[PDB]
Every structure is written in C-alpha cells, then in structure tokens.
Design a protein around this ligand. Structure first.
Ligand SMILES: Cc1cc(-c2noc(C(F)(F)F)n2)ccc1OCCCc1cc(C(=O)N(C)C)no1
Ligand SMILES: Cc1cc(-c2noc(C(F)(F)F)n2)ccc1OCCCc1cc(C(=O)N(C)C)no1
Lengths: 296, 247, 238, 39, 118, 50, 238, 39, 49
C-alpha cells in the first residue's frame, strides 16, 4: 500500500513466543514474495524510536547529479592543411548518455525514465607546444553551442552559414565566464525514455537493435566563434548533464561486467574475478573460509 | 540600481547544486504523462527486494554454480556447513545483490538485514539446520556449541521450503561505514554460520546431495547516507563506437 | 487454498493442484486503453475470446546441462491463432499476458526453476562489439536459450533478477508458476513485429537431479493474451 | 527562485516521499499474513 | 573555502609570461570510494561524488559540508583503538573518518611549467 | 533583469564573514542529536572554574 | 552532615566518616538508555545487583617519589565478577560508575591527592613520534602510573585538570573522595574491549610527609558500575 | 539570506545565550550556601 | 560477596549484616558442618588500606 515514508521504521519491544500454528520465520520463496519476517518475531527486541531520514535515497536525489556525458578536444588553429577527419575549429556530437560508465550504470538501474536535463558546458584551453613550445597566454575565446534537432542540417565548417541559427537554440559563452548552462525539457515522443529497448528501430530488418527511435535527441554543434590566431591552441569542451523532475519505473539488475560499447549491452567480463563472466564475486578458498577473520 | 557584492563561491560549478536554469526551448510542451507500472520513488524500495547471495564464491564453482550451496549427509554430528562474510564494501557473497549494489553507492548504512534460505532438495529429503549470527568482537565460530550462543534460528525442512534469519541492527553507533578496513569497529558486522542441527537424510532414490539458495534483503528500518561513486564500475578507455558519435 | 488454482479465459481453462500463489506484475492487472491515454483515433477492434485465450507453446526438455530458455512477447505468439491474424492485419496492438509455466516430476526429484518476466530484455552479445542481429533476437514460437544465464545474456546479474516479476518452480514444493503481466511500454500502443515488451525467462538455478529411474522432464509454457486491442487495419504483412 | 516562464526550468523536486515497496516485495494476488504459513 | 594561487616556474625558465586563469576540480571522495590516480583519470567524471569546478580568477570556491559523523558528535579525543584486533591506530575514532579531498587542474599542461598552491 | 552594481569588498574572502553557502551533500540527514553531559555554550563558564 | 556518608549498591556498602562531599560529574546521575536514544534493537540484559556493586581494586602505596596512578574504565573492571562476564559475552555495553577513593593517615601526616575523572584521556608518548601501543594503554585492573603528571601524560597541564570532575583528598581534611560518573560517550553504547570512556587519575600534588614513625600509606580504589546494560549476546571473547 | 534547501547550509547561529556554569563550578550533590562553612 | 567497608572514626563500631540467604526455609544445627542444610558460608576481614 502507498504511504508517506520520511524515516526508517521504529522497533517495538517483543516478548517470548510459543504459539502452535504460528511460524513467522518460515516463508515460501516460490511465490515470488520477499520474506515478511519481522525482527520482533525472530528475536526479542526493545523499543527503538528511529529518527534516521531516508531522503538521500530518493530517486530524485540519487539521479539529480551533474555527470560528465561528453568530452571533446580539438585544435584551434589555421586548418588549411588539415585532414578531413580533423575537427577544424568545431565539432559535432550525437547526444547520448552511454559514453561514460558512472552515469550510464546509474541510469540503467531503471527501465523507463522521465526527466528534464540541465546541461552545463565547461571549456578549458591550452597553448600548443608541438614545435611552438612557447607560452604567450590563454585567449578568452567565444564559443557557440547550437542544438541541431532531428532532420535539421548540421554545420560543415567553422564559418558555415548554418551557424546563423534562425530557429535553432544557440548559446554564446566565453571561456572566462562561468560554465554555460541551459535546461533541455523532456523531449521524448513517448511518456518516458526507454533506457532499454528490446526492439528494432525500422520497418525493415537492418535497423539498429536496442535503441528506441522515440528517444533520438539530435546533435550538439560547438565551434569557436573567433577566427584562428597566428598560433595554435587545444580547446577541450566538457558537457555535463543533470536530470531533474525525475520519474522512474521498473528497476533492473545492475550492470556487473564492464561495458564494451555505447551501442549495445555486449559483455566480455574481466580476465579473472571479480566481475568475470564465470565469476562475478572474488574467490575464497572454501565456503567455510572467513576472508577477514578477526583473531585476537 | 541595487548595491551588491559577490560572495566566495560565486561563479563555481558545483555538481550537486540545485538551481533553476534557462529553458533552451521556449513554449515546449512535453508529452503527456501516462501511467506505467512499477514506479520507484525511493531506492530503499529496491533494497527491500530479496536477491541471491554468491555464497559459493570458490574457484571450483562456475557461473550459476556459485549461487547455490550443496549439502550432503554427514557421518559426524554438529558439523559446520558454510559461513558468510557480512562485509558489503569488501568483495564477498553480499556484494552482487540488490541491497549490496544499491548500498555501495553510499558510505553509511543502518538497519536490520534478513537472510532467507530455500531448500531445493527432493520432497523425500529431510533435515534440520541451525543458522547463527554472531555479533562482532571475536573470531568466526567454528563449532556449533559456540555459534549457538548468538542469534540463531533452527530450521526444520518441510512444506514451507524457506526460513528467514534476521540479522538485527546491533551497533554501538547509529550508522556503520562501508570502509575498506573490514576489521574497523565502525564497519564490522559479525558473521553468519550454518551448522547441521541433526543431518540431511534422504532415501536411496533421492539425490544424496541437495542445494540451498541464500537470499538477502534489508528490512524497512534500513537507511543509507553520503552518496558516493560506486566502485563496482569503471573504464580505462573510451567505449567502442563512442568516437563515432563525433563523426 | 493457495495451492489449487483454475484459470479460465475464452474457451481455454487450466487447473493446477501444486501452485504456490500467482504473481501480478508490480501489483497491476491488465486493462483496455482508456480514452485519456489513447493516441490512435480509429476505432480499435477488441476480439475478446477469439484472442484472449491460452496458447500452449512447444515443450522443452529439462536436461542436466540445460542453461535455460526464453520467449519474447508478443513475438512468440505473432503467428498463432486469431491473435496472430490480428497482429498481422494491424499496424498497432496492445495487450497484457497471463503466463502459466508447467513442470512436474516425482517426489524423488529435485530442482529449482526461476520463472521471471523481464520488461525490455535487451540482449547483448558475448565477446564482440557487434550488436545482436535480427535472427538472434526474433525467434518466434520456438524461443531461445540463454548463452550465459549467470549474467542474463546482458552483462547484468542473474542473482538480482528477482527485482523483476517472478515465481519459482521448486520441484519439492510446486509444479507450476503463474504470472499476470500488464501492458508494459513507454507508448500506449506499439508495432508488434519490431518491439517486444516482455521476455519470459526460465532458468534452472538448481539442476534437475534424482537417483530413481530417469524420465523425460518437459517444461511447458501456456500464454494467454489479455485485453487485446488492435488499431490501423490493413492487408496482412506477417 | 525561478523567474523563467517555462515550468521545466525549475530546480529539482526532492519532496516526493511516497513509497509502495509491495509492488516489488509482495506482488501476489493473495496477500500473506504474519505468522501464518504461506503455503 | 578553497583559495588558489599560481606562480611561474623560474627554474631554468626564469622568464615571466603572465599567469594563466586555470580551471580546477575539487572532488570529495568518501570512505570506500576510489580516488583518482592521474590528472586525466576517468574517476574525475564524478557520477555521484560532489565536485566543484572553479577558476583562479573567481573568488575562492566555497561549500558547506554537513555534520557527517556516524555518532551524535565528533570525538576530538578518542581513548581507544579503531579495530577489533590489537594493531589498530590509537587515539583516532573511526566514527569520525571523513575521506579524501582530490584536487586537479582541469586544463592540460602548457608548454611551460607553473607552481600551483591550494 | 535587476540593475545592480558591485560595492568595494565584493569577491573578498573575510575569515570572519557569516553567510550561507551551498550544501555539498543534498538531502543528507545528520545523525540524531543525543544528550551528552558537560555541554558548554559560553567560554566564560570555563574561566569561572578554579 | 557532609563528612559522613554511606554508599550501598547491590550486596556492597561503604561508610566513610571523613568525607567532604561527593561530586556528580557535570551535575548528572547515571541512567538507563532511553528508547528515543537507543540504536541496538535487541532486548538488553540489565543484571542490576549482579553488576551494579562495588569492586575493590588492588591498593597502591603512596611513597615520597610517587608520580601518580591511573585506571581506565571499563578496562580495569573487564575481568572482574559478573560485570567482566557480561562484558566478555556481549558486543555492546553501557554504564555509569560510582568511584570511591580511600586514603587515611594520622593527624601528624600531610599530603594532597587530586582525584579526577578524565573523559577520553587519550595518552601521548614522550619524546617520540610513535603513538602509544596497546600494551601501554590497556593495563587492566593493575592500572598504570603517570610518566609526567605535570602535563597529564598528554601534553596538557595538570594545573587545569580541575576543569574535569574531581575531588581532593587533603590528609588534614578528609580521607576519601567520591565521584559519580554518568555515561560519557559520543555513541549510546560501545564495545568495552577497545574504548575507554573514563580515566581515573590520582596525582599527589602535595607529597606525603611526616616526622612521626613511618607507616605504609596505601591508596584504595572501589568502583561500582551503575545502570549496566549489555547488547549483542554471543560466546565469550575476553 | 538562505535560499538553499538544506538547513545545514545556513549561516552561523550566535544567539544561544543559555549558561549553566554550575556544571563545572559546583558539581556536588549537596549545594553549598553562602557564608555557611562548607565542611 | 556481601561486604561493608569500615572507616575508623568517631563512630567506633560498624555492623556487617549476614542476610538470610538460604535455599530452604530453615537450616539445621547438625554435626555435618559441610551439609547443604547447615553450612552458612564464611566471614572474612581484610585490610582496606
Ligand atoms: C547533452 C545535451 C545538450 C544539449 C544542448 N547543448 O547546447 C544546446 C544549445 F544549443 F541550446 F545551446 N543544447 C541539448 C540536449 C542534451 O541532451 C538531452 C538529454 C536527454 C536524454 C534522453 C536520454 C535517454 O535516452 N534515456 C534516459 C534512456 N537520456 O537523456
Ligand atoms: C576540509 C573538507 C573539504 C571538503 C571538500 N572539498 O571539496 C569538496 C567537494 F568535492 F564537494 F567540492 N568537499 C569536504 C569535507 C572537509 O572536511 C570536513 C570537516 C569535518 C570534521 C570532523 C572533525 C573531527 O574529527 N573533530 C572535530 C574531532 N573536524 O572536522
């Protein structure tokens, strides 16, 4: 039954029990129900007024923490002789929450999640030392982060006319300013994001497995607004996401084996325990061996 | 205008801060909420669900073999069958459980735990066991006459296949700590041991070896504090296809 | 009082004399889609007894080295009876399920099966970066087997699978498990040929054992869709 | 302090103390009674 | 309150070019949590650890830590031993264990060296 | 927005200042208080002891 | 009216005819742990008269060059009578103490003893960076002696030790000191074998002196635990 | 000015003027009277 | 055991009470001094200081 719980339950003192037909310590695991044996029925207890709060385990508190989701370094310089794969004073990122394991594991403790996302962008710069290993100071550059939704065109160069951002939301921020911050609303086409999706994204058979197309977000495009300086710099952009106004459903067994890919739940496990495919828990000599036995 | 001055901490980015921030998409209407079964609002609801302990965490056990303990008929009385370390922070049988996994995101804990064991022998198998919880202070008991001095339940196999051993919260301090010093007075919980009470007795046609499955969960007096990054997951490199997101 | 149970749906009925209880996933019961949650505006078809009935799949043999079995829903039922026809002729479907798993042996036999319904059981592949293919996932009525039940074939833990709606078939205790599944989806309706809401997993945590003369010990699954409705009528696609 | 016009801009909501653990600990049609045998 | 100052290294490179406005990360690592082993360690992603990012040019960073003892009060003096064996440390109550403060420069290193004092 | 201007002393760190500051651990519940003998609220109580 | 006193606890009683008063540490009296402050949920055992009684330790001789003596509680009583047995058989204990220190001489004798109960008397070592070891701290019933009473063996001052609950035995005035100690701890209960809440220190600020024929002048300590309770029963550990 | 949600974030509390020096200056069971000899 | 600590002083006399601690309602004046129906125990006197 639903109830308001703010503190851990109190204990009531209990007396000796010898009652025919009453066996509170016996249970039937087969029904799928967790044992309902109370401490007062297993041992003789005292009265305890428990004042311990439970607020820190609230789902909102558990998940509403800013966590790294994206980290991209690119060179800020004249890119006239750069390769096609190089980030030429800008980068684009297909938004996902599966690249950094600390946040991914916590999110994957649930099947469905509904939340708004607070986005914080932190920027750092360093002078390039390759050949030009001389320090002149760090420039206070202006950056543009543009949110490109599904079906919109992404910029192809630092001076692309797509950056005019007629309708796209863009934020211009300086390195010397505090990190830029914006809130993205819950934008799923369903009532909640599908943390896990046991299905295929297309009406043919070649679509990607395990990614619900309803949760597609889009692209984050970040460029340096300043034209390049005579010397080269390395710019690192870090994006943090904090869920808020959270609703969660259907908790799941936690991830045990190391993650392999951001596209699937493929698993290999460590070479040996702990967290190996054949042994999650570290081994002990035998079931009668106390690993940290206290002697004297 | 309003005269103001900036305090220390102005301009900082605290990952646990709680403020409003500018909406990037004005006038956006989120999809209407729909009822979905299995909503969870406090993580303590998850830790209250029973999950299997890895009691048989030995090199000889592979896969789900590590999730059951085999017991056979013995020819000596009062024999020890197995013990269970009670440290959640260390790598032990309780670590990969709902309670253990959720708790290892925190640093402090309090409240009672419950261990439930299901006997999975044949209907014709019979036996009695004693399950003991020894509060900390000494060595893990190795004999029944010593183990039975602590909290214990004598379990008679029968129609009800499962028994529950309550590990009551017996602690000097309000909370304990998930600290790597397993012998610290702020962390050690004690021991759980299982002895034969009479014997496992089965007829010739039944299997002479029977298995128990041990489950653990927290009672509703359980609580946790001081959120921390779980040591159960980590990465030393970027995951495969992570780079492709930037292509 | 809790060991005997009869389930009657449409023209089908099942009786068990060795049940423990039955589980209602997350304490919910199946129901039709309400007006304040509907999206598709066409009048849905509700076949009722034609589709809301028990379908029995092919039995599987419980062997010593068995790792476990799984069936994905509604994929497993997508070509069976009028449920299959309605699925094939409609773009959208919605339904709960009533699952009854049957396995009996003698009083000299031992073994324990975990019967768990996993919502959105997205499977992972072992020792490869390639995601599972269509043929690996969509097995239909025959279902599949667990490669690594210890981690639920998804890098998680079997020990924590009890967080999902589940029962046990402990041979000394009971010979059947019953689970009632409500509609479990982020959307009010779905395309039945590309997404599976539920996965039924039967995993032998305790292997089958006996010293009496051995016999084949099958496991049989019967699934009844509940409160089926279909929208977006067109030609059959299958 | 929320002067933004869109409600989703607000700070976090940490005041929902409602619980129903029986959804996961006791999802059985027939509720179990204390002391009485389950089977 | 965390106060940061910087100075250009003069050893060999006794030339002054100016003081960079660096970003620092202070992460509170509680008991049982893993501490970072290098400046670019993946532990810095701080999924659940409280971290504060601050700049040298900003006013000193400030945060409040609550009373986090497992007892009702800290034991300024502790006439006891911290473990159930006889080799534990004397005079330190394990109930008052706080944890580790981990501080790094977020910026990658520049071509020249600096000395940072926290 | 609100028009403002910064006063002298803005951004300074005065060791005797008295302001609220951001809680690093949201929703943390401190251990319940327990009666302990010998509470002292003003140091003048100590100097009154021989 | 204030020089004669009788203390009766359990089966033990003490009478003194040369008392000054008696001190109640911080104006408090021992009591059992209340429900709104309890942590351990098991029913505690309260032996009452079996443990709440006077135990007399070994007497010590007051010599000219005596530097002082100390006993740590509950360490000093951890192997005595039923208190010791309960301590050995339980993980947690809680109690106050009633301390009675006895020293008599003649009217031709002079000397002054400071009798002070130090809460959490964490000792320091002299002229070394190494912390005191287990054997230096845990002396049991025999107790210890001050290496440098001038600084209380902890780098503090003896002159300021009067901030702690204390009495004096000034030979010309009185021959006994009585101090009542409540439970003094950051936690409601504690493990008695690893932490000492109180330290009783007897320091001869004014040396024993006389010109009459010399006699042995012992100092005797009697300590009665009060409101003892124990939690976490198990096998004896000691 | 405290807009934080956690109470321990508040500024210092310097308004507790309650005193009881007798806890340290006169911790005797029998209170002493002015002028009258103590012994 | 049961004891009284006696301090010499103006009151020259102290009293040690030997309480009736017996399993049976009565004891017997029988020549078997070690009988469980007769033995009362012992009284001892030690120096306190
Ligand atoms: C990281 C980010 C950055 C921006 C942005 N950066 O700049 C700008 C600009 F241009 F306005 F300035 N917008 C926008 C949106 C972003 O992500 C949205 C998070 C939502 C989500 C879905 C899931 C999921 O699929 N689940 C839980 C199963 N997780 O999280
Ligand atoms: C100095 C400090 C820094 C941080 C911190 N720095 O950064 C961050 C981050 F990551 F959030 F940004 N957290 C956290 C906690 C700290 O100390 C806590 C003081 C408590 C205490 C106990 C005792 C004691 O044992 N007594 C009195 C006997 N004294 O004081």
């Amino acid at each position: 039954i639903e109830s308001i719980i703010k503190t851990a339950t109190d204990t009531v003192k209990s007396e000796i029990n010898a009652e025919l037909g009453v066996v509170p310590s016996l249970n039937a695991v087969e029904t799928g129900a967790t044992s309902n044996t109370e401490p007062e029925e297993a041992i003789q207890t005292r009265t305890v007024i428990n004042q311990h709060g439970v607020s820190e385990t609230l789902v909102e508190n558990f998940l509403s923490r800013a966590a790294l989701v994206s980290k991209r370094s690119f060179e800020y310089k004249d890119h006239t002789s750069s390769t096609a794969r190089a980030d030429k004073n800008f980068f684009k990122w297909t938004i996902n929450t599966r690249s950094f394991v600390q946040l991914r594991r916590k999110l994957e403790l649930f099947t469905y999640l509904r939340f708004d996302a607070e986005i914080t962008i932190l920027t750092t710069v360093a002078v390039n030392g390759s050949g030009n290993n001389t320090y002149v100071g760090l420039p206070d550059l202006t950056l543009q982060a543009m949110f490109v939704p599904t079906g919109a065109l992404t910029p192809e160069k630092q001076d692309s006319f797509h950056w005019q951002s007629g309708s796209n939301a863009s934020v211009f921020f300086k390195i010397s300013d505090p990190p830029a911050r914006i809130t993205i609303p819950f934008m799923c086409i369903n009532s909640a994001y599908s943390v896990f999706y046991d299905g295929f994204a297309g009406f043919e058979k070649n679509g990607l497995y395990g990614i619900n197309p309803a949760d597609t977000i889009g692209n984050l495009c970040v460029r340096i607004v300043n034209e390049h300086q005579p010397v080269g710099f390395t710019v690192t952009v870090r994006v943090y996401m904090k869920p808020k106004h959270i609703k969660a459903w259907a908790p799941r067994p936690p991830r045990t084996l190391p993650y392999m890919s951001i596209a699937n739940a493929n698993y290999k496990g460590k070479e040996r325990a702990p967290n190996a495919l054949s042994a999650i828990i570290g081994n002990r000599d035998s079931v009668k061996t106390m690993p940290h036995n206290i002697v004297n | 205008g309003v005269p103001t001055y900036l305090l220390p901490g102005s301009g900082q980015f605290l990952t646990t801060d709680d403020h409003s921030s500018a909406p990037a998409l004005p006038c956006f209407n989120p999809t209407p909420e729909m009822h979905i079964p299995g909503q969870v609002r406090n993580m303590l609801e998850v830790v209250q669900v029973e999950s299997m302990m890895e009691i048989n965490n030995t090199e000889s056990a592979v896969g789900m073999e590590r999730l059951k303990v085999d017991i056979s008929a013995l020819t000596d009385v009062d024999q020890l069958l197995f013990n269970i370390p009670l440290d959640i922070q260390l790598d032990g049988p309780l670590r990969n459980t709902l309670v253990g996994n959720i708790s290892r995101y925190y640093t402090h804990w309090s409240g009672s735990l419950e261990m439930t064991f299901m006997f999975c022998g044949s209907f014709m198998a019979a036996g009695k066991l004693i399950l003991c919880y020894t509060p900390p202070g000494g060595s893990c008991p190795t004999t029944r006459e010593t183990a039975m001095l602590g909290t214990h339940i004598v379990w008679d196999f029968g129609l009800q296949s499962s028994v529950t051993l309550i590990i009551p919260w017996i602690s000097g301090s309000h909370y304990r700590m998930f600290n790597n010093d397993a012998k610290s007075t702020n962390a050690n919980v004690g021991y759980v041991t299982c002895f034969m009470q009479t014997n496992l007795i089965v007829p010739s046609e039944s299997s002479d070896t029977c298995s128990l499955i041990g489950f653990i969960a927290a009672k509703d007096d359980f609580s946790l504090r001081l959120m921390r990054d779980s040591p159960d997951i980590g990465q030393l490199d970027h995951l495969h296809a992570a780079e492709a997101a930037y292509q | 009082s809790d060991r005997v149970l009869q389930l009657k749906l449409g023209n089908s009925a099942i009786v068990t004399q060795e049940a423990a209880n039955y589980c209602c996933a997350y304490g919910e019961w199946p129901n039709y889609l309400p007006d304040h949650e509907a999206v598709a505006i066409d009048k849905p078809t509700q076949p009722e007894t034609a589709t809301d009935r028990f379908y029995t799949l092919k039995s599987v043999k419980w062997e010593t080295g068995s790792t476990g079995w799984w069936w994905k829903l509604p994929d497993a039922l997508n070509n069976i009876g009028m449920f299959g026809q309605n699925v094939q002729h409609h773009y959208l479907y919605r339904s709960g399920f009533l699952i009854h798993v049957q396995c009996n042996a003698t009083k000299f036999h031992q073994g324990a099966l975990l019967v768990v319904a996993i919502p959105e059981h997205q499977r992972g592949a072992h020792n490869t970066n390639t995601s599972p293919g269509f043929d690996d996932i969509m097995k239909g009525e025959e279902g599949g087997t667990f490669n690594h039940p210890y981690v639920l074939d998804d890098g998680t833990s079997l020990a924590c699978a009890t967080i999902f709606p589940h029962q046990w078939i402990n041979l000394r205790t009971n010979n059947s498990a019953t689970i009632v599944l409500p509609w479990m989806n982020a959307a009010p309706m779905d395309f039945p040929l590309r997404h599976n809401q539920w996965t039924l997993a039967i995993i032998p945590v305790v292997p089958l054992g006996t010293r009496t003369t051995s016999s084949m010990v099958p496991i049989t699954v019967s699934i009844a869709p509940m409160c089926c409705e279909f929208n977006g009528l067109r030609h059959a696609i299958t | 302090i929320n002067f933004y016009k869109d409600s989703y801009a607000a700070s976090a909501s940490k005041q929902d103390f409602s619980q129903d653990p029986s959804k996961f600990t006791e999802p059985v049609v027939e509720g179990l009674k204390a002391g009485a045998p389950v089977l």
